[PDB]
N, CA and C atoms as an extended XYZ file, in Angstrom:
60
Properties=species:S:1:pos:R:3:atomname:S:1:resname:S:1:resid:I:1 pbc="F F F"
N        77.596       62.502       67.730 N   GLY     1
C        77.525       63.368       66.568 CA  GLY     1
C        76.885       64.706       66.880 C   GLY     1
N        77.426       65.771       66.297 N   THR     2
C        76.903       67.114       66.519 CA  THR     2
C        77.211       67.596       67.932 C   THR     2
N        78.496       67.756       68.230 N   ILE     3
C        78.922       68.214       69.547 CA  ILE     3
C        80.376       68.673       69.526 C   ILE     3
N        80.820       69.268       70.627 N   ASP     4
C        82.191       69.751       70.736 CA  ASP     4
C        83.148       68.603       71.044 C   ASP     4
N        84.455       68.898       71.015 N   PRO     5
C        85.498       67.904       71.288 CA  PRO     5
C        85.527       67.482       72.752 C   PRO     5
N        84.447       66.852       73.203 N   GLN     6
C        84.350       66.396       74.585 CA  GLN     6
C        83.894       64.942       74.648 C   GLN     6
N        83.437       64.520       75.823 N   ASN     7
C        82.973       63.151       76.016 CA  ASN     7
C        81.448       63.095       76.059 C   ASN     7
N        80.869       62.246       75.217 N   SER     8
C        79.420       62.099       75.156 CA  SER     8
C        79.019       61.123       74.054 C   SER     8
N        79.447       61.414       72.829 N   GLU     9
C        79.131       60.562       71.689 CA  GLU     9
C        79.661       59.146       71.904 C   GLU     9
N        78.873       58.324       72.590 N   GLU    10
C        79.264       56.947       72.866 CA  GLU    10
C        79.439       56.161       71.569 C   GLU    10
N        78.878       56.688       70.484 N   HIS    11
C        78.972       56.037       69.183 CA  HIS    11
C        80.408       55.615       68.888 C   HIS    11
N        80.573       54.713       67.909 N   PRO    12
C        81.890       54.210       67.509 CA  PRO    12
C        82.727       55.271       66.806 C   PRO    12
N        82.990       56.371       67.504 N   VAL    13
C        83.782       57.461       66.946 CA  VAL    13
C        84.321       58.368       68.047 C   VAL    13
N        85.052       59.403       67.648 N   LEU    14
C        85.626       60.347       68.600 CA  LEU    14
C        84.534       61.010       69.435 C   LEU    14
N        84.514       60.699       70.727 N   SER    15
C        83.520       61.262       71.633 CA  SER    15
C        83.431       62.777       71.467 C   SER    15
N        82.248       63.325       71.726 N   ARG    16
C        82.029       64.761       71.604 CA  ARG    16
C        80.809       65.195       72.411 C   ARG    16
N        80.875       66.398       72.974 N   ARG    17
C        79.777       66.929       73.772 CA  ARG    17
C        79.662       68.441       73.599 C   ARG    17
N        78.429       68.937       73.588 N   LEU    18
C        78.180       70.366       73.430 CA  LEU    18
C        76.962       70.799       74.237 C   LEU    18
N        76.998       72.030       74.740 N   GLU    19
C        75.895       72.565       75.528 CA  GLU    19
C        75.938       74.091       75.560 C   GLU    19
N        75.017       74.687       76.310 N   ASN    20
C        74.948       76.139       76.425 CA  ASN    20
C        76.238       76.699       77.018 C   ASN    20
């Protein structure tokens, strides 16, 4: 949660990742 359309959010949902 709270990230871009990438891989990271291991949670039971659409993965997402965000950074600088």
